[PDB]
């Protein structure tokens, strides 16, 4: 009924809250601790925290330890996303209480191993898809990801819970979500999808509401508010 729900982002790199432009490796700004950032949207009334090890995601290590520092000092609901692609990274991530996770390469890399999470754990899970156009890419060795809408299918059928949108070219850029694409997954799914990347301003945000009665639920906010675009308090007034 109008509102969208906003998870503020930490996305950790080498112990730090970083932020990357079109999620490239090296892009990173940092902007200091993750569990000071998690803590300051909390205490500025978050509902949620997008948590997520950018490490694990790469391949470049992982955050484990801090990762579970930080989803321990939340009473919020927390949304789990990096490297998560077998059963004991998976362990892992769900052992910190968190609300959801999300699968992202482990979706076009192994479809059977989704699938049977998907069975076991039911709307813990959720699946991130990264858009170029009409394809989805990953971060393992698949650049090519598959089309889309069959995958929309296969994991529409399969029961997949909730689905996380990116386009990856509005990544941390500022440049506005990319409403087209949000609109176009709401069309091929009935399950609730989350928009992710490329907020700017307020009005992107209350533009991204326009579009819950089409099926979108909520929007992970990550630079503009580490830039200071608007306050936390700010979006949470105009998200309804």
Known sequence: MSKLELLPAVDVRDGQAVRL????????????????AALAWQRSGAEWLHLVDLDAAFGTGDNRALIAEVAQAMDIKVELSGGIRDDDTLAAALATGCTRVNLGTAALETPEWVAKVIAEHGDKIAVGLDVRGTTLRGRGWTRDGGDLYETLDRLNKEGCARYVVTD?????????????????????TDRPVV??????????????????????????????????????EEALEATS
Not at 173 to 186: A, I, R, S
């Open 195 to 232: 928009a992710s990347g490329g907020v700017s301003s307020l009005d992107d945000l209350r533009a991204i509401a326009g579009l819950v009665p089409a099926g979108v639920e909520g929007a992970i906010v990550g630079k503009a508010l580490y830039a200071k675009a608007f306050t936390l």
């Open 21 to 36: 432009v079109h999620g490239e490796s090296g892009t990173e700004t940092s902007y200091g601790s993750p569990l000071e």
């Open 168 to 188: 990856i070219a509005k990544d941390g850029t500022l440049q506005g979500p990319n409403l087209e694409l949000l609109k176009n997954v709401c069309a091929a």
